[PDB]
Design a protein around this ligand. Structure first.
Ligand SMILES: O=c1ccn([C@H]2C[C@H](O)[C@@H](CO)O2)c(=O)[nH]1
Ligand SMILES: O=c1ccn([C@H]2C[C@H](O)[C@@H](CO)O2)c(=O)[nH]1
Lengths: 263, 258
């Protein structure tokens, strides 16, 4: 009986897209009309450098620092949100509005950065392992920025999947946890000043780690168990931030809202 | 309003000196990619001064004070990269640096009509968030193609559009960068920000009344730079014996060039 890998199945990625759609709609109901392909590319650019700032890349400051891999995990998940949004916006975009660079061959619109020291990479050759190494991370994310600039949101999703695998965490489980926090943020006034990330010492991102301790790679991808698996993660995050029941949503509600919008 | 060539050449010498203070053989230790990365990272710090997020803090205003600082940080790194290219043997020169600009980037353009610098990479007014975004997504691509040259030119046009004195700000942040190395930045005994007080933000009042003519005058500039240096040193209460002046840095650089 064959072990399931990290290589998110089509059906699972569609369900993820429905959650992403729901979250984006909380932010603006007409989000596909108001957002641009460049917004998502910019967002990925900005998170890519935030992620890189988790590593000790600076030679003039804090010379003995080590990588903050907990922050890297969350940032990879943030990049996944934006890339998934971009890949789905690209499917929604009319062909006369499709930017020429997305259709040009990659070689023409990017130069691939390689680390100096021998390493393994993902199948495209854009991301480099191990990601515990700062030089590997630097070349990887310099490559991701260039992919974003040529609108290759789907290539980026693939890379992030291989990255999560190298770093040995459950991408999908983290996605669900952060997706739930993102929803909580919007409910709680992130747009105006009302909600702030830092709450009496700790960043809100930091509470998600315990919310996904009890989930397995299979639990979260398996057609039979995933809806319940996802729902328990949402529940853990909601309960962590003391969100009343009437404000919560379960996975099946997000699928339903996605489907009715599909009319 | 643009920096005479001979002034640039002298800024490079202060930059050389600051880099040597950080690592004695900086040219052999650092790589082209180090500087290109630095510029990338500072470019996103610059964009993060603008209200670019559509999901959060929707009434935020651009922090153009911080943009001034970041432009000057990119300036430090772009001067360093340009010098690195000059010292890199031809057979180690990355091939992307020799290609026509059209081949190594896709020029992002804002949606709304605007003016730009002469290359068409930076867009005015830089008070506008989308103009800034398209500008620094272009700068990042220039860094990837090792075009430190072009970047320097773009930053100069940026400073002109934003109506501040690029050279004065450079000398001020340069001085701070020295102050940081003196105070133990490398081992964490000195921090850039604590209790809502960021060291960069105290620089503005040190150069408030400094004219463009002073700092660019190919015969008055040394004295002008020195007063900026002294004002920054004084604002951070640095001992006289821990201070260095322009001629010291020039002399260091002229001495190290043998
Ligand atoms: O339209 C948006 C805007 C923001 N985010 C998420 C992505 C990221 O995880 C978080 C900000 O760090 O907000 C979205 O998913 N969609
Ligand atoms: O080798 C270096 C390393 C850092 N810095 C300065 C540049 C920038 O102004 C500041 C960090 O923002 O440190 C240099 O000038 N040279």
């Amino acid at each position: 009986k064959r072990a399931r890998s990290a290589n998110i199945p089509g059906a699972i990625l569609h369900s993820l897209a429905e959650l992403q759609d729901g979250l984006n709609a909380m932010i603006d109901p007409s989000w596909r009309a108001v957002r641009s392909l460049d917004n998502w590319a910019l967002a990925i650019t900005m998170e890519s450098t935030e992620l890189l700032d988790s590593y000790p890349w600076k030679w003039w400051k804090n010379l003995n620092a080590t990588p903050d891999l907990a922050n890297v995990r969350i940032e990879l998940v943030d990049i996944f949100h934006f890339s998934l949004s971009g890949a789905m916006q690209m499917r929604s975009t009319p062909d006369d509005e499709i930017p020429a660079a997305s259709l040009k061959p990659l070689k023409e619109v990017m130069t691939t950065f390689l680390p100096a020291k021998e390493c393994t990479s993902d199948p495209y050759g854009f991301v480099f392992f191990p990601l515990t190494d700062t030089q590997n991370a630097i070349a990887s994310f310099r490559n991701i920025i260039q992919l974003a600039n040529a609108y290759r949101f789907d290539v980026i999703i693939e890379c992030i999947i291989y990255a999560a695998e190298d770093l040995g965490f459950n991408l999908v489980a983290y996605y669900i946890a952060k997706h739930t926090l993102n929803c909580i943020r919007q409910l709680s006034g992130y747009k105006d000043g009302s909600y702030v990330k830092v709450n009496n010492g700790v960043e809100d991102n930091s509470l998600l780690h315990n919310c996904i301790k009890d989930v397995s790679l299979d639990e979260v991808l398996d057609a039979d168990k995933y809806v319940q698996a996802w729902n328990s993660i949402m529940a853990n995050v909601y309960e962590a931030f003391q969100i009343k029941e009437s404000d919560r949503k379960d996975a099946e509600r997000w699928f339903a809202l996605a489907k009715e919008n599909r009319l």
